[PDB]
Design a protein around this ligand. Structure first.
Ligand SMILES: O=C1[C@H](O)CO[C@@H](CO)[C@@H]1O
Ligand SMILES: O=C1[C@H](O)CO[C@@H](CO)[C@@H]1O
Ligand SMILES: [Co+2]
Ligand SMILES: [Co+2]
Lengths: 275, 275
């Protein structure tokens, strides 16, 4: 069964952390990995390495060619830059936006459709969280001006309160839906004691990507109600699914492949969310 | 689709807490409730009220007749009695076992197949937890001598450590499988940050009943991977499913019925676990 599913490359970090694309080289193990991921049936990647204008020590144009030639789309990337104490205090985030301009140019050239902040710290005050919301709106606008969408990926910590407000809820309510979506990591929502579906119903259309992760292999633990999540996918607004596997019951590549196979065999997972 | 599913009567406590079966009466609202639960398609009940030799102010023989005449089996009951500081210190739990003798006689007469302790406190030491394990073994033996099985129902607190050992694991490892099973409340395992399936694989056959609960209606939240749980049901050793619904999106009776309908429509829920 062919379905659109991205792989978060963090899932294969054990291979990718050791590949040597420095000093003009292209590591055959890097290319082989990409080709194997396509052969498993992944349709696209989400990067988890962006540093010094490069993805896994490849220029954006190289990364594009590498991924596309393996039969994969360049879908998304996890990267962000936090605000300085200064920026937070002044609310002036010019400095940080300059970095984003370079980040965004690089992502565009790699053929990315999305850029997603993986993490932010729980701030001390709602005022700080507010500044972050404004910064994300502006990053998101710049992404759109360069053909891409910006989103925010959660763990569990966002379900805590800042002053007396749940951080996640506040972030959703104070970001412009045109410019910021939420890449809901459903596993982490459940770990954070919350209901993916209730979030979908309360903020329909904001969850344009899912991170589909589990305790180990996807769909194995009993810890994530994928069936209910997918049944409510229309309300969520999801357009792409990103599989992530960071902890394993078996060899990594095999783990990543059986994880996919869960989604391909699941009758409630449609073959595309972007038709 | 007919399947065997019990209803935990705690789910309809709002009705049952107000019914008047005192002074020789049989409340028509009580009987109607039972009949409605059968009409929804529940096949059996698990009681959540045992006090003064009675179930909802009915003698065991009356309760049996009440439930059975509505078209339901009397499957199980939630009740327990904790040990005194004395009993824990001496390790002599005669006093408590006397109560259990009466409890067990009453359960037998009601036609019960199972008796399940709903709750115990996290003890201070492994020595206390040990005494509890021995007490449960002896309760369980008495239950078997009277034709029934004793089990232990979890929330999330059992996933904490006592000295340096997870309480749940210790309880499982230090109880006799003949005499104590675990009524795994899969929702609470997941809330307690753990994997139902991993518990099944680590302690196959110990989980002879499931409590099938969710945040509100069963199967609605995204918070419980029922599909994976049920796929691994053989390893668990489950023989009966008990639906519980304690928090509602709609009127109680309707909530309880749509909760069931999730299981009846779920292809991974078999029509019986006791064939
Ligand atoms: O799921 C994960 C990790 O839990 C950490 O955050 C994300 C950043 O790449 C990643 O995909
Ligand atoms: O699920 C529940 C509650 O969460 C409390 O424990 C059980 C006792 O009847 C009940 O079925
Ligand atoms: Co993730
Ligand atoms: Co329960």
């Amino acid at each position: 069964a062919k379905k659109e599913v991205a792989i978060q490359l963090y899932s294969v970090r054990d291979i990718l952390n050791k590949v040597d694309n420095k000093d003009g080289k292209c590591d055959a193990a890097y290319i082989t990995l990409l080709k194997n991921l396509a052969k498993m049936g992944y349709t696209s990647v989400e990067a988890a390495n962006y540093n010094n204008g490069k993805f896994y020590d490849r220029t954006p144009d190289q990364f594009k060619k590498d991924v596309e030639s393996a039969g994969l789309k360049v879908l998304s990337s996890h990267c962000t830059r936090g605000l300085s104490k200064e920026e937070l205090a002044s609310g002036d985030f010019s400095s940080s936006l300059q970095w984003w301009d370079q980040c965004i140019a690089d992502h565009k050239a790699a053929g990315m459709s999305y850029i997603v902040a993986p993490w932010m710290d729980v701030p001390k005050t709602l005022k700080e969280l507010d500044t972050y919301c404004a910064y994300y709106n502006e990053i998101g606008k710049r992404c759109k001006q360069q053909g891409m969408s910006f989103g925010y990926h959660n763990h569990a910590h966002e379900f805590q309160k800042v002053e007396d407000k749940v951080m996640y809820d506040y972030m959703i309510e104070h970001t412009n839906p045109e410019y910021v979506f939420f890449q809901m990591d459903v596993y982490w929502v459940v770990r954070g004691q919350n209901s993916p579906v209730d979030y979908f119903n309360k903020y329909p259309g904001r969850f344009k990507m899912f991170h589909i992760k589990d305790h180990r292999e996807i769909g194995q633990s009993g810890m994530v109600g994928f069936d209910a999540i997918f049944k409510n996918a229309k309300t969520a607004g999801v357009k792409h699914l990103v599989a992530e596997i960071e902890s394993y019951s078996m060899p990594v590549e095999k783990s990543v492949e059986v994880s996919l196979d869960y989604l391909l065999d699941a009758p409630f997972v449609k073959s595309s969310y972007a038709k």
